[PDB]
């Protein structure tokens, strides 16, 4: 534990990396994350919404 | 059923074959089409489900018996097992970046 | 062949503590090295389960301890037997059991498995027989007495003949034999785990991940099981169809699973090696 | 069977190929009503009734 400041920067960024993919696995208030899914189980409309 | 009859006085074997559907889950259907192997090239997948775009490599990552799909930290589509023979592939986009 | 047995005494049950044990694999996804984090049922650990007693020794003087209760079912059973001679035989899961509505039957009887889904009239004492032979020394199983009479079926299920053991065998316990039964979603899925031990008593400690067995699509509305137990009846006890008959020794587990986090660890080929729970103790959360 | 003993043959758990069916020539009627027999074979069912 004496290159504690050069290994918190890396588990700095691998943390922000992680959390800026699993951001993609989140509704956001609409039905589903996959858009494939979306425009194809859905009306016009409410799949561009 | 006397053999002299005209062509309306004869045995009709009738079939009434119907169909209807419950509320329990289907376990009866029709047969399924399948396409070759084209390994090494940017394609899209549709094994059982599970869509995706990106080259399929013969990979060694060993599945279990009963484990079908494969994924990483990530939680990621990674590695997908053929259907019809037992072999674990390996999935990865194809070239991109800037120029 | 409906028969209520006689001769059996009452006694208060006895509740052995889990051991952290009942963590089954919770889908089809492989995981190298991954501390992944689901959300599932299980069962919480440190949680003392219902200990059903079945034995017939000298010392007890008449008991004849044959425990085969209609347990509740609400969304799981961990259900663990540490047999010896092969005496837990079969379930009776079903709804009303009163051939009103159908009941899922899964009893793996002298030549296979049967899981057949109809509706049925249990008895009040569902059990199975096997008769013991002096003159060829051969365990037979005859009585079939778990139901009365049958409806019109649905789908159904029966595999390839084989043969057990089907012997007293005299001493400790020698098998030990796990399972879970969900249903969510018309989906009976049923998981199962075999590892040997070498204990007599309570349930013993250590950890394994129960594979995934199958996944009948039968969709009903199972609330409500039983145990299929089998009797010894022989040459010494004498009697009728309903006093005369023995008990072996066999003990079984029934526990009951609830909505909680846990912490999995995947190892390097993808079998669950250790497991921690999230609302056990302030180390653990 | 009988005109008033009519056998059922309910049947599933299995996967159904009707290319069979209409691509004989042993029939007299196959006077289908509202299935489409050309896309049966895209249409999942539970129980098959014979
Ligand atoms: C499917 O059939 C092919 C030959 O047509 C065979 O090589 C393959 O092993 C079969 N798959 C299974 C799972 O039996
Ligand atoms: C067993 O007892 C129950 C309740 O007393 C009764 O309904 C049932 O008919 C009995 N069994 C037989 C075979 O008579
Ligand atoms: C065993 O479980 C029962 C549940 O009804 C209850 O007495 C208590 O939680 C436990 N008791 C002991 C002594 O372990
Ligand atoms: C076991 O069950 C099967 C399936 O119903 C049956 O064919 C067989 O006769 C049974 N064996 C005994 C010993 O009851
Ligand atoms: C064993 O003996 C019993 C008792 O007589 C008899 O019923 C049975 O058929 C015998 N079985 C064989 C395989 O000899
Ligand atoms: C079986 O028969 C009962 C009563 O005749 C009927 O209600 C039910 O729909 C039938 N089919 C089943 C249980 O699959
Ligand atoms: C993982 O699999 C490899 C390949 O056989 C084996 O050598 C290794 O011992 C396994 N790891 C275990 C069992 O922990």
Redesign the pocket.
């Known amino acids: 534990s004496a290159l504690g400041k050069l290994q918190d920067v890396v588990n700095q960024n691998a943390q922000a990396l992680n959390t800026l993919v699993k951001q993609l696995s989140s509704n956001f208030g609409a039905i589903s994350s996959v858009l494939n899914d979306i425009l194809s189980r859905l009306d016009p409309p409410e799949a561009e919404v | 059923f006397q053999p002299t009859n005209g062509v309306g006085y004869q045995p009709y074997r009738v079939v009434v074959l119907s169909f209807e559907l419950l509320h329990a889950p289907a376990t009866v259907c029709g047969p399924k089409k399948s396409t070759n192997l084209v390994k090494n090239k940017c394609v899209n997948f549709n094994f059982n489900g599970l869509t995706g775009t990106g080259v399929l490599t013969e990979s060694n990552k060993k599945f279990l018996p009963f484990q079908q799909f494969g994924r990483d930290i990530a939680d990621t589509t990674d590695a997908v097992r053929d259907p019809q023979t037992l072999e674990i592939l390996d999935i990865t986009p194809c070239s991109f970046g800037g120029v | 062949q409906c028969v209520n047995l006689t001769t059996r005494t009452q006694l208060p049950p006895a509740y052995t503590n889990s051991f952290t044990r009942g963590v089954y694999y919770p889908d089809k996804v492989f995981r190298s090295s991954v501390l992944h984090s689901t959300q599932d049922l299980f069962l919480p650990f440190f949680s003392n389960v219902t200990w059903f007693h079945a034995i017939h020794v000298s010392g007890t003087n008449g008991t004849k301890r044959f425990d085969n209760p209609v347990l509740p079912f609400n969304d799981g059973v961990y259900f663990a037997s540490t047999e010896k001679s092969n005496i837990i035989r079969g379930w009776i899961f079903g709804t009303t059991l009163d051939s009103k509505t159908q009941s899922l039957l899964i009893v793996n009887?002298?030549?296979?498995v049967?899981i057949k889904v109809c509706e049925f009239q249990f008895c009040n004492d569902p059990f199975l027989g096997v008769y013991y032979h002096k003159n060829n020394k051969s365990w037979?199983?005859?009585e079939?007495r778990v139901y009365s009479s049958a409806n019109n079926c649905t789908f159904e299920y029966?595999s390839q003949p084989f043969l057990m053991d089907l012997e007293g065998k005299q001493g400790n316990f020698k098998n030990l034999r796990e399972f879970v039964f969900k249903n969510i979603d018309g989906y009976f899925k049923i998981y199962s785990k075999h590892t040997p031990i070498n204990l007599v008593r309570d349930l013993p400690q250590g950890f394994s991940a129960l594979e995934p067995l199958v996944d009948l699509p039968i969709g009903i509305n199972i609330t409500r099981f039983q145990t299929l137990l089998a009797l010894h009846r022989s040459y010494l006890t004498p009697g009728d169809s309903s006093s005369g008959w023995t008990a072996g020794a066999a003990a079984y587990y029934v526990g009951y699973l609830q909505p909680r986090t846990f912490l999995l660890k995947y190892n390097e080929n993808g079998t669950i090696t250790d497991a921690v729970d999230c609302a056990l103790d302030p180390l653990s959360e | 069977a009988s005109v008033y003993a009519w056998n059922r043959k309910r049947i599933s758990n299995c996967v159904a190929d009707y290319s069979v069916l209409y691509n004989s020539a042993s029939f007299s009627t196959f006077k289908c009503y509202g299935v489409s027999p050309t896309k049966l074979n895209d249409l999942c069912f539970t129980n098959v009734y014979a």
């Open positions: 009887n002298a030549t296979n049967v037979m199983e005859s079939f029966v």
